[PDB]
Curated annotation (Swiss-Prot):
The lineage of its organism: Eukaryota, Metazoa, Chordata, Craniata, Vertebrata. Non-enzymatic covalent modifications of reactive cysteines by electrophile metabolites inactivate the BCR(KEAP1) complex. Accumulation of fumarate promotes the formation of cysteine S-succination (S-(2-succinyl)cysteine), leading to inactivate the BCR(KEAP1) complex and promote NFE2L2/NRF2 nuclear accumulation and activation. Nitric oxide-dependent 8-Nitro-cGMP formation promotes cysteine guanylation (S-cGMP-cysteine), leading to NFE2L2/NRF2 nuclear accumulation and activation. It comes from Mus musculus. The modification S-(2-succinyl)cysteine is found at residue 289. The chain holds residues 325 to 613 of 624 of the full protein. One of its GO terms (biological process) is ubiquitin-dependent protein catabolic process. Changing residue 231 to A: Impaired interaction with SQSTM1/p62. Belongs to the KEAP1 family. Component of the BCR(KEAP1) E3 ubiquitin ligase complex, at least composed of 2 molecules of CUL3, 2 molecules of KEAP1, and RBX1. Interacts with NFE2L2/NRF2; the interaction is direct. Forms a ternary complex with NFE2L2/NRF2 and PGAM5. Interacts with (phosphorylated) SQSTM1/p62; the interaction is direct and inactivates the BCR(KEAP1) complex by sequestering it in inclusion bodies, promoting its degradation. Interacts with NFE2L1. Interacts with BPTF and PTMA. Interacts with MAP1LC3B. Interacts indirectly with ENC1. Interacts with SESN1 and SESN2. Interacts with HSP90AA1 and HSP90AB1. This is Kelch-like ECH-associated protein 1. Disruption phenotype: Early postnatal lethality caused by abnormal cornification. Mice survive until weaning and probably die from malnutrition resulting from hyperkeratosis in the esophagus and forestomach that cause gastric obstruction. Defects are caused by constitutive activation Nfe2l2/Nrf2, leading to constitutive expression of phase 2 detoxifying enzymes. Mice lacking both Nfe2l2/Nrf2 and Keap1 reverse the hyperkeratosis phenotype and are healthy and viable in normal conditions.
Length: 289
C-alpha cells in the first residue's frame, strides 16, 4: 500500500493509539483510537481492511487478555468489531494466506497456547486448525510462498530459538532449522525469499542481532544488526525495505523507527513515533479518507 499503520502498544499501560506513517514524506497521522486499549496484539491487512488481533489490556482497572478481532476501514476512519477468536491470545502472532488470517500462539493468563485458528473474512468466522508442535507466546509469524512460519517465543518455561512451519493443505506443522539465537518478542517478517527475525529477548538481554532463514538452503545467517537493542517491537515491509517500530531496550520504551535496506545491508534511522511504546501491532495499507 502506502502507509505503515501502528495500532495499540504499551507505555505504563496498554494504549489505544492508531497512527499512520508515510515513508514518502515523513509525516505521521493520528487516526481513530481502538475501542479497547491493548498491547501484545498483532496487525495485518486483508482486502484493504486493517485488522487488530488478540493482545491484552494492561490497565489500572485490571488486566484482560483479548480474544478480540477488530477491523479498521481507512475509507471511513472507523473500527468495527469482528468475530472473536476461540480464546484470548496475548503476545500473539498472525499471518495472512489466501485472504485468510491465522492466529498463532499467545498467552491466556498462565496458559501458553500451542493452538492455532483461521479467520475467513467472507463468513466472519474462526475455525481451529492443527496446533503447533510447541507452545509459543511472544512468537514471530510470517508467510512465505503460502506457508506459515512460527519463530521463537516462550513456551511457558524456556525461551526458544526453535521454529516450525505450517503446511495448510496437510494441516500439519513440522520443525525447521532453529535460529542461531534465542528470541522471544522478536520482529519477524518476510523479504524476498528469506524470513527475518530481528531483536527480541534471549532470557538475559534485549537483542539488536538480526538473522534470516533461506527456505531453499534451510539455514539462518546473521545480517547487519540494528542500531538499537529492542524486544516487543513492531515490524513490517514496505517497498523492499524492513521497518522496525518501537520496542523496549531494557532502559527506555523506544520511539525509534529503523529501516533495513537489504542491498546495502545497513540500518538507518528514519523517524520517531510520536511517543515511545512496545508491543504494537503493525501493518501496511492505503491512505485514509
Ligand atoms: C519481550 C520479553 N520481555 C519480557 C516479556 C522483555 O523484554 C522484558 C524483560 C525485562 C523487563 C521488561 C521486559 C519488557 C518487555 C516489554 C515491556 C516491558 C518490559 C519490562 O519491563
Amino acid at each position: 500500500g502506502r502507509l505503515i499503520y501502528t495500532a495499540g502498544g504499551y507505555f505504563r499501560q496498554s494504549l489505544s493509539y492508531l497512527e499512520a506513517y508515510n515513508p514518502s514524506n515523513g509525516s505521521w497521522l493520528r487516526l481513530a483510537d481502538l475501542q479497547v486499549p491493548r498491547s501484545g496484539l498483532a496487525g495485518c491487512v486483508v482486502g484493504g481492511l486493517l485488522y487488530a488481533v488478540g493482545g491484552r489490556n494492561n490497565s489500572p482497572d485490571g488486566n484482560t487478555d483479548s480474544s478480540a478481532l477488530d477491523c479498521y476501514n481507512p475509507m471511513t476512519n472507523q473500527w468495527s468489531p469482528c468475530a472473536s477468536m476461540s480464546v484470548p491470545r496475548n503476545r500473539i502472532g498472525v499471518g495472512v494466506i489466501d485472504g485468510h488470517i491465522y492466529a498463532v500462539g499467545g498467552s491466556h493468563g498462565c496458559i501458553h497456547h500451542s493452538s492455532v485458528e483461521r479467520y475467513e473474512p467472507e463468513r466472519d468466522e474462526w475455525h481451529l486448525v492443527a496446533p503447533m508442535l510447541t507452545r509459543r507466546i511472544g512468537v514471530g509469524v510470517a508467510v512465505l510462498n503460502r506457508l506459515l512460519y512460527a519463530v521463537g517465543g516462550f513456551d511457558g518455561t524456556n525461551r526458544l530459538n526453535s521454529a516450525e512451519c505450517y503446511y495448510p493443505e496437510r494441516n500439519e506443522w513440522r520443525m525447521i532449522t532453529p535460529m542461531n539465537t534465542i528470541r522471544s518478542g522478536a520482529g519477524v517478517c518476510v523479504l524476498h525469499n528469506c524470513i527475518y527475525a530481528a531483536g527480541g529477548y534471549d532470557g538475559q538481554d534485549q537483542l539488536n542481532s538480526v538473522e534470516r532463514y533461506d527456505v531453499e538452503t534451510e539455514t539462518w545467517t546473521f545480517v547487519a544488526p540494528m542500531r538499537h537493542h529492542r524486544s516487543a517491537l513492531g515490524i513490517t515491509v514496505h517497498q523492499g525495505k524492513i521497518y522496525v517500530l518501537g520496542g523496549y531496550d531494557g532502559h527506555t520504551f523506544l520511539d525509534s523507527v529503523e529501516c533495513y535496506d537489504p542491498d546495502s545491508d545497513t540500518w538507518s534511522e528514519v523517524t520517531r513515533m510520536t511517543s515511545g511504546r512496545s508491543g504494537v501491532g503493525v501493518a501496511v495499507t492505503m491512505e485514509p479518507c
